[PDB]
Amino acid sequence: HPETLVKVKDAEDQLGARVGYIELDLNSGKILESFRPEERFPMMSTFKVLLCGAVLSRIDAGQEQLGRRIHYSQNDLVEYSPVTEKHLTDGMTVRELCSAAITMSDNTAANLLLTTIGGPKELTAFLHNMGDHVTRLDRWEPELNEAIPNDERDTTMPVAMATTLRKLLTGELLTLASRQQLIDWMEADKFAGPLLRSALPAGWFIADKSGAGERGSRGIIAALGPDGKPSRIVVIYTTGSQATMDERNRQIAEIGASLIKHWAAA
């Protein structure tokens, strides 16, 4: 059962594309393993977690409310919007939009949330404020998934993203209640089944968010561990492959299997 770094390299061979990987201890933030940690990759829908972090930060500051109801129209609807397309009459609350953006990867939900903060530049500013000067959101859904080769728009580095996620889930950046809501949304993710979740044993905890884009882009961010408690952060991205969705999913799932099989190693 291949060691994780061996598997990551193998995934590059299989996919004909670069793969980035990092694994952090959740408690200490120390890097346990990495591969292309400082290369840039399209975030795709993995940014939706960071967006809801920015929204929760505003909630904590009294600038936003979880229960605030936003009505919107047909014009706002874009592709891959399975929840927002069913609430044209009634609208959705901020809390519901974040649930939709994270757990159902709802694109229109993400756009409505970006409007609440004033656009992608404001998400980038939130990230800068907390110390991540690498992750950048430039565009709205769905254009942010374009993934033109070597275009740095709408990208992160594995090492930047992993630490930003750790800070949102466990740091003082968000209140306890907000930290817990963010992880609860990620735990409830329904749009990542063929990825890390497919390798997880019974009894484990996983809070995650996946992404897919053009040019074969695929990725996932996660906090996971045994015994009902997360203990590591994992970030995986790939871009460039011509392989099918199922083939890309399979490679990520196999990286997960290698991580799980060697987890107990001292």
Answer yes or no: are the C-beta atoms of 248 and 15 closer than 8 Å.
Answer: yes
Torsion 108-113-119-125 (CA) sign: negative
Residue 124's identity, in one-letter code, is: T
Resolution (A): 1.5
Q: Which domains does the chain have, with CATH numbers?
A: 1-266 (3.40.710.10)
CA angle at residue 65 from 59 to 67, to 5 degrees? 140
Q: Clarify whether 81 is annotated catalytic.
A: no
Catalytic residue among 38, 96, 122, 143: 143
Task: Specify the DSSP element, H or E, that contains 79.
Answer: none
| Residue list for the binding site | 209-211
Answer yes or no: are the C-beta atoms of 84 and 106 closer than 8 Å.
Answer: yes
Here the contacts of 174-181 (C-beta below 8 Å, separation 24 or greater) are 174/53, 174/56, 174/57, 174/60, 175/60, 178/56, 178/57, 178/59, 178/60, 181/56
Q: Where are the alpha helices (DSSP H) in the chain?
A: 4-15, 47-60, 94-103, 107-117, 120-130, 158-170, 176-187, 245-261
At 111, list the tokens. 């756009």
- DSSP string of 110-175? HHHHHHHHTSHHHHHHHHHHHT--S------TTGGG---TT--TTEE-HHHHHHHHHHHHHSSSS-
At 216, list the tokens. 């074969």
Catalytic residue among 45, 57, 99, 178: 45
C-alpha–C-alpha distance, residues 145 and 141, integer Å: 7
At 211, list the tokens. 């992404």
Q: Clarify whether 143 is annotated catalytic.
A: yes
